[PDB]
Amino acid sequence: QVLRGTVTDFPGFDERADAETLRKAMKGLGTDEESILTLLTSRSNAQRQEISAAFKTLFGRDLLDDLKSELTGKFEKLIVALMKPSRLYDAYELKHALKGAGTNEKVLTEIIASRTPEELRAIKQVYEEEYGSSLEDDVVGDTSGYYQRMLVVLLQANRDPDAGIDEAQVEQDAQALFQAGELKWGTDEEKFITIFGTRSVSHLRKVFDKYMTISGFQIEETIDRETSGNLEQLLLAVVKSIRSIPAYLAETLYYAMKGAGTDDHTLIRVMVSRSEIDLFNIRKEFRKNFATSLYSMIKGDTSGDYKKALLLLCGE
Ligand SMILES: [Ca+2]
Ligand SMILES: [Ca+2]
Ligand SMILES: [Ca+2]
Protein backbone atom coordinates (compact mmCIF):
# COMPACT_ATOMS: atom_id res chain seq x y z
CA GLN A 1 0.00 0.00 0.00
CA VAL A 2 2.47 2.57 -1.29
CA LEU A 3 0.95 6.02 -1.75
CA ARG A 4 1.94 7.60 -5.07
CA GLY A 5 0.32 10.36 -7.10
CA THR A 6 -0.25 10.91 -10.80
CA VAL A 7 1.57 14.26 -11.12
CA THR A 8 5.26 14.78 -10.28
CA ASP A 9 7.83 17.51 -10.90
CA PHE A 10 8.18 18.10 -14.64
CA PRO A 11 11.78 17.37 -15.70
CA GLY A 12 13.60 20.17 -17.48
CA PHE A 13 11.58 22.90 -15.78
CA ASP A 14 11.95 26.61 -16.55
CA GLU A 15 10.02 29.15 -14.49
CA ARG A 16 10.25 31.85 -17.18
CA ALA A 17 9.52 29.96 -20.42
CA ASP A 18 6.38 28.45 -18.90
CA ALA A 19 5.41 31.93 -17.69
CA GLU A 20 5.88 33.29 -21.21
CA THR A 21 3.87 30.34 -22.54
CA LEU A 22 0.90 31.02 -20.25
CA ARG A 23 1.07 34.73 -21.12
CA LYS A 24 0.63 34.42 -24.89
CA ALA A 25 -2.32 32.06 -24.37
CA MET A 26 -4.25 34.61 -22.30
CA LYS A 27 -2.78 37.58 -24.19
CA GLY A 28 -4.37 38.70 -27.44
CA LEU A 29 -7.91 38.12 -28.65
CA GLY A 30 -9.33 35.14 -26.78
CA THR A 31 -7.56 32.18 -25.20
CA ASP A 32 -5.59 29.00 -25.91
CA GLU A 33 -7.01 26.68 -23.25
CA GLU A 34 -5.20 23.58 -24.51
CA SER A 35 -1.84 25.29 -23.93
CA ILE A 36 -2.93 26.06 -20.35
CA LEU A 37 -4.28 22.65 -19.31
CA THR A 38 -1.29 20.87 -20.86
CA LEU A 39 1.10 23.16 -18.96
CA LEU A 40 -0.69 23.05 -15.60
CA THR A 41 -1.58 19.35 -15.49
CA SER A 42 1.99 18.35 -16.41
CA ARG A 43 3.58 20.57 -13.73
CA SER A 44 3.58 19.87 -10.01
CA ASN A 45 1.89 22.16 -7.50
CA ALA A 46 5.34 23.27 -6.32
CA GLN A 47 6.37 24.08 -9.90
CA ARG A 48 3.04 25.83 -10.52
CA GLN A 49 4.02 28.42 -7.89
CA GLU A 50 7.44 29.14 -9.43
CA ILE A 51 5.63 29.80 -12.71
CA SER A 52 3.22 32.13 -10.90
CA ALA A 53 6.13 33.99 -9.30
CA ALA A 54 7.95 34.28 -12.63
CA PHE A 55 4.71 35.38 -14.31
CA LYS A 56 4.32 38.33 -11.92
CA THR A 57 8.02 39.24 -11.99
CA LEU A 58 8.08 39.23 -15.81
CA PHE A 59 4.81 41.01 -16.68
CA GLY A 60 3.53 42.55 -13.44
CA ARG A 61 0.26 40.61 -13.66
CA ASP A 62 -1.23 38.14 -11.20
CA LEU A 63 -1.35 34.74 -12.89
CA LEU A 64 -4.37 33.69 -10.81
CA ASP A 65 -6.28 36.93 -11.44
CA ASP A 66 -5.69 36.59 -15.20
CA LEU A 67 -7.00 33.01 -15.27
CA LYS A 68 -10.35 33.89 -13.67
CA SER A 69 -10.99 36.58 -16.28
CA GLU A 70 -9.83 34.72 -19.39
CA LEU A 71 -11.61 31.49 -18.39
CA THR A 72 -15.10 30.61 -17.16
CA GLY A 73 -17.35 27.66 -16.41
CA LYS A 74 -16.21 24.39 -14.87
CA PHE A 75 -12.83 24.85 -16.57
CA GLU A 76 -12.29 27.98 -14.46
CA LYS A 77 -13.02 26.10 -11.23
CA LEU A 78 -10.53 23.31 -11.98
CA ILE A 79 -7.69 25.55 -13.18
CA VAL A 80 -7.70 27.75 -10.07
CA ALA A 81 -7.81 24.60 -7.92
CA LEU A 82 -4.49 23.40 -9.34
CA MET A 83 -3.05 26.89 -8.83
CA LYS A 84 -3.82 27.04 -5.11
CA PRO A 85 -0.77 25.79 -3.15
CA SER A 86 -1.05 22.44 -1.41
CA ARG A 87 -0.23 24.25 1.84
CA LEU A 88 -3.31 26.47 1.30
CA TYR A 89 -5.73 24.19 -0.57
CA ASP A 90 -7.48 22.16 2.14
CA ALA A 91 -7.88 25.27 4.29
CA TYR A 92 -9.20 27.16 1.25
CA GLU A 93 -11.89 24.54 0.62
CA LEU A 94 -12.88 24.40 4.29
CA LYS A 95 -12.95 28.21 4.27
CA HIS A 96 -15.46 28.60 1.44
CA ALA A 97 -17.52 25.66 2.75
CA LEU A 98 -17.84 26.61 6.45
CA LYS A 99 -19.73 29.80 5.55
CA GLY A 100 -23.39 30.30 6.45
CA ALA A 101 -26.21 28.12 7.70
CA GLY A 102 -26.16 26.50 4.25
CA THR A 103 -22.72 25.08 4.95
CA ASN A 104 -21.80 22.17 2.67
CA GLU A 105 -21.26 19.47 5.29
CA LYS A 106 -19.79 16.98 2.80
CA VAL A 107 -16.68 19.11 2.23
CA LEU A 108 -16.21 19.34 5.99
CA THR A 109 -16.91 15.62 6.37
CA GLU A 110 -14.65 14.55 3.49
CA ILE A 111 -11.64 16.70 4.42
CA ILE A 112 -11.63 16.49 8.23
CA ALA A 113 -12.32 12.75 8.41
CA SER A 114 -9.92 11.57 5.68
CA ARG A 115 -6.92 13.71 6.70
CA THR A 116 -4.26 12.43 9.08
CA PRO A 117 -3.73 14.27 12.39
CA GLU A 118 -0.45 15.63 11.00
CA GLU A 119 -2.31 16.85 7.90
CA LEU A 120 -4.88 18.59 10.13
CA ARG A 121 -2.30 20.31 12.34
CA ALA A 122 -1.10 22.21 9.27
CA ILE A 123 -4.68 22.88 8.16
CA LYS A 124 -5.63 24.57 11.44
CA GLN A 125 -2.56 26.84 11.35
CA VAL A 126 -2.83 27.80 7.67
CA TYR A 127 -6.52 28.58 8.22
CA GLU A 128 -5.60 31.04 10.98
CA GLU A 129 -2.75 32.66 9.01
CA GLU A 130 -4.55 33.37 5.73
CA TYR A 131 -7.94 34.07 7.35
CA GLY A 132 -9.21 35.67 10.54
CA SER A 133 -10.41 33.29 13.25
CA SER A 134 -9.65 29.61 13.96
CA LEU A 135 -10.85 26.62 11.97
CA GLU A 136 -12.28 24.98 15.10
CA ASP A 137 -13.95 28.23 16.20
CA ASP A 138 -15.59 28.68 12.79
CA VAL A 139 -16.72 25.03 12.75
CA VAL A 140 -18.75 25.16 15.98
CA GLY A 141 -20.30 28.49 14.95
CA ASP A 142 -22.08 27.12 11.87
CA THR A 143 -22.55 23.62 13.32
CA SER A 144 -24.52 21.98 16.12
CA GLY A 145 -25.42 18.63 17.62
CA TYR A 146 -23.38 15.44 17.81
CA TYR A 147 -22.21 16.11 14.25
CA GLN A 148 -20.39 19.18 15.61
CA ARG A 149 -18.85 17.35 18.57
CA MET A 150 -17.31 14.72 16.29
CA LEU A 151 -15.85 17.38 13.98
CA VAL A 152 -13.93 19.10 16.78
CA VAL A 153 -12.68 15.77 18.16
CA LEU A 154 -11.00 15.10 14.81
CA LEU A 155 -9.80 18.72 14.60
CA GLN A 156 -7.72 18.26 17.77
CA ALA A 157 -5.40 15.97 15.75
CA ASN A 158 -4.51 13.97 18.87
CA ARG A 159 -5.39 10.46 17.71
CA ASP A 160 -3.66 7.62 19.52
CA PRO A 161 -0.52 6.46 17.67
CA ASP A 162 -0.06 3.01 16.17
CA ALA A 163 2.15 1.06 18.57
CA GLY A 164 0.68 -2.42 19.01
CA ILE A 165 -2.70 -4.15 19.28
CA ASP A 166 -4.38 -4.56 22.68
CA GLU A 167 -6.63 -7.62 22.82
CA ALA A 168 -8.21 -6.43 26.08
CA GLN A 169 -9.03 -2.96 24.74
CA VAL A 170 -10.14 -4.32 21.36
CA GLU A 171 -12.70 -6.66 22.93
CA GLN A 172 -13.95 -4.07 25.43
CA ASP A 173 -14.29 -1.34 22.80
CA ALA A 174 -16.13 -3.76 20.51
CA GLN A 175 -18.43 -4.59 23.42
CA ALA A 176 -18.84 -0.94 24.44
CA LEU A 177 -19.92 -0.08 20.89
CA PHE A 178 -22.27 -3.07 21.00
CA GLN A 179 -23.40 -2.05 24.50
CA ALA A 180 -24.08 1.44 23.10
CA GLY A 181 -25.68 0.28 19.85
CA GLU A 182 -27.96 -2.72 19.47
CA LEU A 183 -28.21 -3.72 23.13
CA LYS A 184 -28.57 -0.23 24.60
CA TRP A 185 -31.80 0.65 22.82
CA GLY A 186 -31.65 4.13 21.40
CA THR A 187 -28.12 5.43 20.89
CA ASP A 188 -25.41 6.81 23.19
CA GLU A 189 -23.68 8.82 20.47
CA GLU A 190 -20.92 10.08 22.79
CA LYS A 191 -19.36 6.61 23.08
CA PHE A 192 -18.97 6.43 19.29
CA ILE A 193 -17.23 9.82 19.17
CA THR A 194 -14.63 8.76 21.74
CA ILE A 195 -13.72 5.44 20.11
CA PHE A 196 -13.89 6.47 16.44
CA GLY A 197 -11.90 9.66 17.07
CA THR A 198 -9.26 8.87 19.71
CA ARG A 199 -8.04 5.27 19.33
CA SER A 200 -5.29 4.47 16.86
CA VAL A 201 -5.90 3.35 13.28
CA SER A 202 -4.50 -0.14 13.85
CA HIS A 203 -6.52 -0.50 17.06
CA LEU A 204 -9.79 0.46 15.36
CA ARG A 205 -9.14 -1.85 12.40
CA LYS A 206 -9.11 -4.75 14.87
CA VAL A 207 -12.08 -3.38 16.81
CA PHE A 208 -14.05 -3.31 13.55
CA ASP A 209 -13.42 -7.03 13.03
CA LYS A 210 -13.97 -7.93 16.70
CA TYR A 211 -17.26 -6.00 16.71
CA MET A 212 -18.44 -8.04 13.71
CA THR A 213 -18.04 -11.44 15.38
CA ILE A 214 -19.74 -10.43 18.65
CA SER A 215 -22.72 -8.73 16.95
CA GLY A 216 -23.10 -10.07 13.40
CA PHE A 217 -23.24 -6.61 11.83
CA GLN A 218 -20.35 -4.74 10.32
CA ILE A 219 -19.44 -1.50 12.05
CA GLU A 220 -20.85 0.41 9.07
CA GLU A 221 -24.27 -1.26 9.33
CA THR A 222 -24.77 -0.37 13.00
CA ILE A 223 -23.89 3.27 12.25
CA ASP A 224 -26.65 3.66 9.64
CA ARG A 225 -29.28 1.80 11.67
CA GLU A 226 -28.75 3.99 14.75
CA THR A 227 -27.72 7.39 13.34
CA SER A 228 -29.06 9.70 10.65
CA GLY A 229 -28.28 13.01 9.00
CA ASN A 230 -24.78 14.45 8.95
CA LEU A 231 -23.81 12.41 12.02
CA GLU A 232 -24.40 9.21 10.03
CA GLN A 233 -22.17 10.43 7.20
CA LEU A 234 -19.38 11.54 9.55
CA LEU A 235 -19.26 8.16 11.31
CA LEU A 236 -19.18 6.24 8.03
CA ALA A 237 -16.55 8.63 6.64
CA VAL A 238 -14.06 8.03 9.45
CA VAL A 239 -14.66 4.25 9.37
CA LYS A 240 -14.02 3.99 5.63
CA SER A 241 -10.96 6.22 6.05
CA ILE A 242 -9.56 4.17 8.93
CA ARG A 243 -9.97 1.00 6.85
CA SER A 244 -8.26 2.60 3.84
CA ILE A 245 -8.05 6.32 3.04
CA PRO A 246 -7.60 5.86 -0.76
CA ALA A 247 -10.60 3.50 -0.71
CA TYR A 248 -12.80 6.21 0.84
CA LEU A 249 -11.89 8.92 -1.67
CA ALA A 250 -12.47 6.38 -4.45
CA GLU A 251 -16.03 6.06 -3.16
CA THR A 252 -16.41 9.85 -3.01
CA LEU A 253 -15.36 10.02 -6.67
CA TYR A 254 -17.56 7.13 -7.82
CA TYR A 255 -20.80 8.57 -6.43
CA ALA A 256 -19.87 12.06 -7.67
CA MET A 257 -20.16 10.90 -11.30
CA LYS A 258 -23.51 9.07 -11.31
CA GLY A 259 -26.92 10.47 -10.54
CA ALA A 260 -28.84 12.97 -12.62
CA GLY A 261 -25.46 14.57 -13.32
CA THR A 262 -21.90 15.24 -12.27
CA ASP A 263 -20.83 16.60 -8.87
CA ASP A 264 -18.09 18.69 -10.44
CA HIS A 265 -17.04 20.41 -7.20
CA THR A 266 -16.41 17.09 -5.45
CA LEU A 267 -14.53 15.54 -8.38
CA ILE A 268 -12.34 18.63 -8.69
CA ARG A 269 -11.55 18.74 -4.97
CA VAL A 270 -10.56 15.08 -4.59
CA MET A 271 -8.60 14.72 -7.84
CA VAL A 272 -6.58 17.90 -7.18
CA SER A 273 -5.96 17.64 -3.43
CA ARG A 274 -4.65 14.08 -3.89
CA SER A 275 -2.95 14.45 -7.29
CA GLU A 276 0.45 14.35 -5.54
CA ILE A 277 -0.53 12.10 -2.61
CA ASP A 278 -2.43 8.89 -3.38
CA LEU A 279 -4.42 9.40 -6.58
CA PHE A 280 -2.84 6.30 -8.12
CA ASN A 281 -4.05 4.33 -5.10
CA ILE A 282 -7.49 5.91 -5.59
CA ARG A 283 -7.76 4.70 -9.19
CA LYS A 284 -6.31 1.36 -8.02
CA GLU A 285 -9.12 0.88 -5.50
CA PHE A 286 -11.47 2.33 -8.14
CA ARG A 287 -10.90 -0.47 -10.67
CA LYS A 288 -11.29 -2.95 -7.78
CA ASN A 289 -14.52 -1.90 -6.05
CA PHE A 290 -16.64 -0.68 -9.00
CA ALA A 291 -15.43 -2.75 -11.99
CA THR A 292 -14.45 0.31 -14.04
CA SER A 293 -11.61 2.80 -14.39
CA LEU A 294 -11.61 6.43 -13.32
CA TYR A 295 -10.44 7.34 -16.83
CA SER A 296 -13.66 5.85 -18.22
CA MET A 297 -16.27 7.53 -16.01
CA ILE A 298 -14.64 10.94 -16.46
CA LYS A 299 -14.72 10.39 -20.23
CA GLY A 300 -18.49 9.95 -20.25
CA ASP A 301 -19.62 12.41 -17.57
CA THR A 302 -17.60 15.51 -18.54
CA SER A 303 -17.07 17.62 -21.65
CA GLY A 304 -14.87 20.23 -23.34
CA ASP A 305 -11.50 21.38 -22.05
CA TYR A 306 -12.79 20.59 -18.55
CA LYS A 307 -12.45 16.84 -19.18
CA LYS A 308 -9.07 17.14 -20.92
CA ALA A 309 -7.40 18.47 -17.77
CA LEU A 310 -9.16 15.86 -15.64
CA LEU A 311 -7.90 12.98 -17.79
CA LEU A 312 -4.35 14.34 -17.95
CA LEU A 313 -4.54 14.55 -14.16
CA CYS A 314 -5.50 10.86 -14.17
CA GLY A 315 -2.83 9.62 -16.58
CA GLU A 316 -4.52 7.05 -18.83
CA1 LIG B 1 -7.26 37.35 -24.54
CA1 LIG C 1 -30.78 0.99 19.62
CA1 LIG D 1 -24.25 11.07 -14.09
- Give the per-residue SS3 of the chain: CCCCCCCCCCCCCCHHHHHHHHHHHHCCCCCCHHHHHHHHHCCCHHHHHHHHHHHHHHHCCCHHHHHHHHCCHHHHHHHHHHHCCHHHHHHHHHHHHCCCCCCCHHHHHHHHHHCCHHHHHHHHHHHHHHCCCCHHHHHHHCCCHHHHHHHHHHHCCCCCCCCCCCHHHHHHHHHHHHCCCCCCCCCCHHHHHHHHHHCCHHHHHHHHHHHHHHHCCCHHHHHHHHCCCHHHHHHHHHHHHHHCHHHHHHHHHHCCCCCCCCCHHHHHHHHHHCCCCCHHHHHHHHHHHCCCCHHHHHHHHCCHHHHHHHHHHHCC
**Technique used by the depositors:** X-ray
Distance 294 CA to ligand 3 centre (A): 13
| Domain boundaries defined on the chain | 15-83, 88-156, 167-243, 245-314
Distance 254 CA to ligand 3 centre (A): 10
CA separation for the pair 213, 137 (Å, rounded): 40
> Using CA of residue 241, residue 267, residue 6, residue 135, what is the dihedral sign?
negative
Torsion angle, alpha carbons of 15, 280, 253, 80, to 10: 0
Distance 23 CA to ligand 1 centre (A): 9
Q: Which amino acid makes up residue 183?
A: L
CA separation for the pair 42, 313 (Å, rounded): 8
Distance 114 CA to ligand 1 centre (A): 40
Q: Which ligand is nearest to the CA of 215?
A: 2
CA separation for the pair 243, 264 (Å, rounded): 26
10 by DSSP, 3-state: which?
coil
Q: Which ligand is nearest to the CA of 260?
A: 3
Distance 180 CA to ligand 2 centre (A): 8
Q: Which ligand is nearest to the CA of 33?
A: 1
The CATH classification number of 88-156 equals 1.10.220.10
Q: Which amino acid makes up residue 22?
A: L
Q: Which ligand is nearest to the CA of 22?
A: 1
Distance 95 CA to ligand 3 centre (A): 28
Distance 134 CA to ligand 2 centre (A): 36
Distance 211 CA to ligand 1 centre (A): 61
Q: Which amino acid makes up residue 172?
A: Q
Closest CA to 316 of 289, 287, 273: 287
Closest CA to 168 of 215, 197, 207: 207
Distance 291 CA to ligand 3 centre (A): 17
DSSP state of 261: S
CA separation for the pair 142, 151 (Å, rounded): 12
> What's the length of the chain?
316
Return the CATH number of 167-243, one of 3.40.50.261, 3.40.190.10, 3.40.140.10, 1.10.220.10: 1.10.220.10
Distance 210 CA to ligand 2 centre (A): 19
| Distant-in-sequence, close-in-space partners of 59: CB < 8 Å, separation ≥ 6 | 19, 23
Instruction: Give the architecture-level CATH label for domain 245-314.
Output: Orthogonal Bundle (1.10)
Distance 226 CA to ligand 2 centre (A): 6
Return the CATH number of 15-83, one of 1.10.220.10, 1.20.58.740, 3.40.50.300, 1.10.645.10: 1.10.220.10
